[PDB]
Amino acid sequence: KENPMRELRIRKLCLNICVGESGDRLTRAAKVLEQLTGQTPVFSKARYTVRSFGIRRNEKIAVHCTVRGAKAEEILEKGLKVREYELRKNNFSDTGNFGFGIQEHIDLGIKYDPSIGIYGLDFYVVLGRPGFSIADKKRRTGCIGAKHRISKEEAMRWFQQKYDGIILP
RNA sequence: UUUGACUGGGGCGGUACACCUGUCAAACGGUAACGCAGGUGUCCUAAGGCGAGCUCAGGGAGGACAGAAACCUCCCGUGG
Numbered sequence: 001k002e003n004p005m006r007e008l009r010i011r012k013l014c015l016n017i018c019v020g021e022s023g024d025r026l027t028r029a030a031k032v033l034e035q036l037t038g039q040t041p042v043f044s045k046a047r048y049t050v051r052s053f054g055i056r057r058n059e060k061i062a063v064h065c066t067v068r069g070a071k072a073e074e075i076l077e078k079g080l081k082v083r084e085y086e087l088r089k090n091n092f093s094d095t096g097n098f099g100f101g102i103q104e105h106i107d108l109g110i111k112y113d114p115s116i117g118i119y120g121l122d123f124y125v126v127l128g129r130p131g132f133s134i135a136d137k138k139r140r141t142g143c144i145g146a147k148h149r150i151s152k153e154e155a156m157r158w159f160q161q162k163y164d165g166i167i168l169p
Numbered sequence: 170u171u172u173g174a175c176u177g178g179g180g181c182g183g184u185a186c187a188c189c190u191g192u193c194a195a196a197c198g199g200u201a202a203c204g205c206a207g208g209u210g211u212c213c214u215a216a217g218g219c220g221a222g223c224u225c226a227g228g229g230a231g232g233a234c235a236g237a238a239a240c241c242u243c244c245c246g247u248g249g
């Protein structure tokens with residue numbers, strides 16, 4: 001019926017903790033993200049200097065990491081369990097991606113540690129079909145055709161099919 | 170003994186006094202007014218040299234606190 005190469009999959013899961021300042025909190029936030037995924041994350045600096053937010057330019061204010069494959073699949077399940085497998089209809093972008101936030105990281109089955117603290121984090125899911133890497137390869141770089149593109153509706157349906165989730169208006 | 174020069178008289182003023190960009194300038198080049206709009210006496214151990222990878226400004230959509238503005242992601246983006 002459907003081509004096997006049109007199957008939607010998790011291209012990557014992007015986890016971001018924007019602490020907003022450099023020092024104890026960012027270092028501890030990195031440990032939260034590191035032990036949630038097993039991957040050492042990277043520090044994002046501030047592009048501007050905003051007086052309201054108390055951030056200067058070239059100051060590490062956030063910690064983020066990218067996970068792929070089965071490890072990204074199972075972390076995503078923990079996130080939807082916390083969200084009770086339901087998302088608002090507006091959580092889906094027009095490019096076939098969606099995301100959600102977690103207020104407390106220990107809701108993801110992570111033991112709390114007093115010397116670390118409690119943290120929130122941001123989950124962004126990038127979907128895709130086989131062949132999306134042509135836009136990323138160095139040689140013969142190509143742009144995906146219009147039909148391959150994942151529309152907002154086909155991302156919402158995939159969420160309903162896989163995690164039997166709920167879409168709220 | 171000296172107490173510059175240019176200058177729509179000289180003085181005051183300015184530097185058109187050594188230079189650079191665009192124009193004037195009349196499609197080679199050259200071309201003047203104390204013509205017009207500006208800049209220079211610096212700065213850099215990299216902002217020099219090579220190589221490698223990468224793509225920018227901006228905009229759209231989306232994502233806990235996060236909002237016009239913090240960070241993450243996708244998309245458009247001939248250089249804006």
Ligand SMILES: [Mg+2]
Pocket residue numbers: 022023026027060
């Ligand atoms: Mg740090």
Ligand SMILES: [Mg+2]
Pocket residue numbers: none
């Ligand atoms: Mg004279």
Ligand SMILES: [Mg+2]
Pocket residue numbers: none
């Ligand atoms: Mg001379």
Ligand SMILES: [Mg+2]
Pocket residue numbers: 194
């Ligand atoms: Mg000429």
Ligand SMILES: [Mg+2]
Pocket residue numbers: none
């Ligand atoms: Mg001529």
Ligand SMILES: [Mg+2]
Pocket residue numbers: none
């Ligand atoms: Mg000429």
